[PDB]
Amino acid sequence: PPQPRKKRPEDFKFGKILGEGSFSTVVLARELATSREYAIKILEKRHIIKENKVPYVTRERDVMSRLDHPFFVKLYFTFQDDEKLYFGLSYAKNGCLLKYIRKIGSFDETCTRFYTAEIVSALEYLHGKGIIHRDLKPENILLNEDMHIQITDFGTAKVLSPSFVGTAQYVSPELLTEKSASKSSDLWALGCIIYQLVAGLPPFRAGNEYLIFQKIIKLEYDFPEKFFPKARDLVEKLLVLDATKRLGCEEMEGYGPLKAHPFFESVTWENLHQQTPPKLT
Numbered sequence: 709p710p711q712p713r714k715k716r717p718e719d720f721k722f723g724k725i726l727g728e729g730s731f732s733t734v735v736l737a738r739e740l741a742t743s744r745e746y747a748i749k750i751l752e753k754r755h756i757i758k759e760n761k762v763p764y765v766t767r768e769r770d771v772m773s774r775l776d777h778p779f780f781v782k783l784y785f786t787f788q789d790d791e792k793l794y795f796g797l798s799y800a801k802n803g804c805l806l807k808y809i810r811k812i813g814s815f816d817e818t819c820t821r822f823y824t825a826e827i828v829s830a831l832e833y834l835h836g837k838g839i840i841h842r843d844l845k846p847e848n849i850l851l852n853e854d855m856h857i858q859i860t861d862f863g864t865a866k867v868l869s870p871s872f873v874g875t876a877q878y879v880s881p882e883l884l885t886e887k888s889a890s891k892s893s894d895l896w897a898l899g900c901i902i903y904q905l906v907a908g909l910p911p912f913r914a915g916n917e918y919l920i921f922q923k924i925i926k927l928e929y930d931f932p933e934k935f936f937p938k939a940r941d942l943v944e945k946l947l948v949l950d951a952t953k954r955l956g957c958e959e960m961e962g963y964g965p966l967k968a969h970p971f972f973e974s975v976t977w978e979n980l981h982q983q984t985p986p987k988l989t
């Protein structure tokens with residue numbers, strides 16, 4: 709099998725900086741021959757080698773190549789010169805989910821339901837292929853032109869075959885105690901997102917990381933008075949201190965029961981990406 713010609717920087721007309729990470733820079737670029745917009749992640753090798761992020765960059769590449777699903781950002785090509793690596797990723801036109809959370813204050817019942825469903829749909833794929841995100845957050849969940857989700861950031865994800873702490877607010881308690889992450893770590897992260905979509909804020913917030921960590925292990929959060937009752941129950945079955953008792957985990961017998969939850973009564977899981985996402989309040 710012959711892969712398309714190995715690309716090079718000159719093949720593009722670079723545009724605005726979409727995002728700036730710690731080890732990389734993401735710039736919108738247009739391919740010259742095709743006139744296609746790709747978001748090229750640009751990483752400096754010398755800075756990668758010194759910071760020991762060689763595994764992290766490799767893992768990000770390997771995972772995003774393997775994913776073949778609409779709710780996940782596609783890696784179209786990899787190329788490099790002397791000092792830099794270039795990652796040809798898809799361009800999420802609308803931006804962060806967090807962006808749209810802040811913009812509208814909080815999602816209503818239909819909007820939450822729909823976008824919750826898409827994350828579940830995508831998680832079932834990711835965990836089905838034996839990968840654990842470990843850093844799932846509204847910032848990582850991106851939205852394309854038609855306003856569907858496209859989950860990104862897989863450098864820190866864990867691939868299973870038979871050591872890292874994520875963003876403080878969406879961290880599961882078993883990471884802070886046992887140093888061992890599972891599929892259900894993401895399902896904890898899922899519950900926080902469901903809460904955040906309804907409340908407008910994640911469940912655990914404080915002045916610093918330590919106090920946030922403190923509240924998580926103690927399970928210190930509570931619901932507003934208007935919080936959707938069927939969404940509340942789902943969160944309750946997802947934000948559990950014991951990872952084996954979390955709705956959706958292997959001990960809770962896969963994703964079937966999670967999808968079955970009353971909160972997803974009207975949702976047709978058939979073809980969500982072909983469906984039309986609700987407008988945001």
Ligand SMILES: *CCC(=O)NCCNc1cc(NCCS)ncn1
Nearest residue numbers: 726727747798799800803804847860
């Ligand atoms: C929340 C911050 C933000 O807006 N980041 C830029 C996201 N836009 C974007 C991302 C990508 N790929 C993500 C690779 S890390 N492509 C196109 N636009």
